[PDB]
Amino acid sequence: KPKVFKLGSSGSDVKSIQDKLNNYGYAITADGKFGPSTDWAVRDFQYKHNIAMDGSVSDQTMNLLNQTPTDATRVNSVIQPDPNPDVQSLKAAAENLANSNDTPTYTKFFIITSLKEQRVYVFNGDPHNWKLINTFQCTSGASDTPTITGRFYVQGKGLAFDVICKYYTQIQGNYLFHSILFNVVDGTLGASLSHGCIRLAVQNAKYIYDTLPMGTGIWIY
């Protein structure tokens, strides 16, 4: 078979894969060792290119990595804060929260959901140097199907999933961030159908979907 590079691979070919991922905007260390950050970047790359998301690089992925990036395929690992006035209002407190705690991540982003506040905070930067780029309200799971707590990584995504939700981002298994249910479906019925998921205004689910690459750290508490 053709050569396959994956988690654990090393050498100058890996280094060039990493250089190409950096050209695509993934901001990883190009050291020639295919670690988790390279795996996650490859998975995101594959998702954005509508090819199988397995985290391995063979001919198909390599061919695409050799194309010039475009607006459709390039990741921005620096994002300017949203102009929503709540960003500025909560900036200091949210940044203090993120910077003073463990925030494991494989991207230049991090997302916190505080269940007691029913609020989401989205950051750009690195551990202990996070900048708040967005914040918004959420609705998490009802008490009989509560949202999972813990630390996770963005695992998967989709544009949509007899009711529909838009712009889902997978936390773990069936626990997702997604839009309000759709004609809007809310109330006790909306909570029963959403189970443990985190519901957001459509624009905010879309924001997470558009901004956070696979491997972005997640903290829910």
**With contact defined as beta carbons under 8 Å apart, do 159 and 186 qualify?**
no
The Cα–Cα gap between 68 and 109 comes to 24
Number of DSSP helices (H) and strands (E) in the chain, helices first: 6, 9
What are the residue boundaries of the structural domains of the chain, listed by start? 1-76, 77-221
PDB resolution in Å: 1.8
The catalytic residue among 128, 165, 195, 197 is 197
- Pair type for strands 166-172 and 156-160: antiparallel
Residue 197 annotated to the active site: yes
Q: Quick one: residue 55, left, alpha or beta (phi over 0 = left, psi -120 to 50 = alpha)?
A: left
The catalytic residue among 138, 165, 178, 195 is 178
The DSSP string of 30-65 is -SSB--HHHHHHHHHHHHHTTS--SS-BSHHHHHHH
**Dihedral sign from CA coordinates of 205, 23, 98, 85:** negative
- Which two tokens mark 47? 């998702």
The Cβ of residue 82 has, within 10 Å, a number of other Cβ atoms equal to 18
Residue 178 annotated to the active site: yes
Experimental method: X-ray
The amino acid sitting at 161 is F
188 φ, ψ (degrees, to nearest 5): -65, -30
Burial class for 144, CB neighbours closer than 10 Å (0-12, 13-18, 19+): exposed
Alpha helix stretches (DSSP H) within 55-184? 59-65, 85-99
The Cα–Cα gap between 51 and 49 comes to 6
